[PDB]
Amino acid sequence: PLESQYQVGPLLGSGGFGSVYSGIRVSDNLPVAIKHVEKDRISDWGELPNGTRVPMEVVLLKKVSSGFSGVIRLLDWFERPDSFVLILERPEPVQDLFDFITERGALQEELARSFFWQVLEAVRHCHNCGVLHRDIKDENILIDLNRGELKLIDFGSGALLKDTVYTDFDGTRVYSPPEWIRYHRYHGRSAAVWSLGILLYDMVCGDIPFEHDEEIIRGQVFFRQRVSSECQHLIRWCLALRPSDRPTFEEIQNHPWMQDVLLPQETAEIHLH
Numbered sequence: 001p002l003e004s005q006y007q008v009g010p011l012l013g014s015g016g017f018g019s020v021y022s023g024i025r026v027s028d029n030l031p032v033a034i035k036h037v038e039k040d041r042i043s044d045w046g047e048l049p050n051g052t053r054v055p056m057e058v059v060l061l062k063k064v065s066s067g068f069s070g071v072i073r074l075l076d077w078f079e080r081p082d083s084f085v086l087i088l089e090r091p092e093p094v095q096d097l098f099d100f101i102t103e104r105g106a107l108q109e110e111l112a113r114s115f116f117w118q119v120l121e122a123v124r125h126c127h128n129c130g131v132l133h134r135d136i137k138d139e140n141i142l143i144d145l146n147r148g149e150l151k152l153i154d155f156g157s158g159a160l161l162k163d164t165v166y167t168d169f170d171g172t173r174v175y176s177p178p179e180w181i182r183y184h185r186y187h188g189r190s191a192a193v194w195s196l197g198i199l200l201y202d203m204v205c206g207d208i209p210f211e212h213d214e215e216i217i218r219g220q221v222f223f224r225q226r227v228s229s230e231c232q233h234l235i236r237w238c239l240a241l242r243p244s245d246r247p248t249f250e251e252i253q254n255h256p257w258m259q260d261v262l263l264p265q266e267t268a269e270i271h272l273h
């Protein structure tokens with residue numbers, strides 16, 4: 001069973017998502033993360049291609065868990081009487097982006113460009129797999145410090161991607177768009193672009209731009225740090241009040257600020273090693 005298959009290490013974190021432990025797969029010593037989610041806390045349920053009743057998180061992870069290393073991979077899952085247990089791949093050494101920014105402050109634009117580009121590629125992979133993350137933020141991004149590779153985590157607030165309106169949301173409010181705050185309605189892709197604007201501002205300024213609902217609704221972007229005109233333009237574009245005024249992923253990646261990105265290994269060599 002699960003208990004014999006894995007060696008439990010220390011608690012890595014706990015919160016809205018559940019409890020996550022560091023671990024080692026006993027068969028090949030592979031580093032893993034063991035996530036426990038209480039059944040009473042799971043509101044969104046779904047079913048696998050076979051038809052087993054599992055949390056939506058398990059459905060979304062299976063849809064995205066393949067060769068591409070931009071999303072944390074689900075290795076296995078187990079059902080207990082009062083919880084679900086998820087075995088996830090664990091990079092080592094690792095640091096989440098929230099802890100990274102907290103320790104190092106506002107990122108150099110070359111570093112933010114590499115990081116932002118990788119997040120964009122990871123989000124495009126999710127969308128191509130029919131998955132909408134809904135909680136893109138610094139806390140949900142892991143940095144593989146040796147490879148300079150970023151990984152999206154926590155699909156616990158996610159949904160299947162659709163072209164119709166979403167009227168439910170349980171992600172982070174300070175990353176949520178003005179249409180959600182005002183009307184309790186949003187479309188997947190344009191809401192994801194708004195959260196990406198919040199994230200990019202956070203990378204280059206060291207903090208999020210808005211705290212209160214009134215600020216999100218006004219959408220006036222003030223720069224507290226020295227930021228290039230091209231970067232400011234891209235941020236202000238992602239943070240357009242009207243969802244239809246926001247750039248597509250293609251327009252973000254073709255933006256002049258996004259040109260000449262470093263490879264992840266070059267990123268680790270210059271900024272992480």
Ligand SMILES: NCCOc1ccc(Cl)c(Cl)c1
Pocket residue numbers: 012013014020032033072088089090091094142153
């Ligand atoms: N948010 C607390 C840490 O959560 C995680 C989740 C997944 C992995 Cl692979 C790791 Cl290393 C840590």
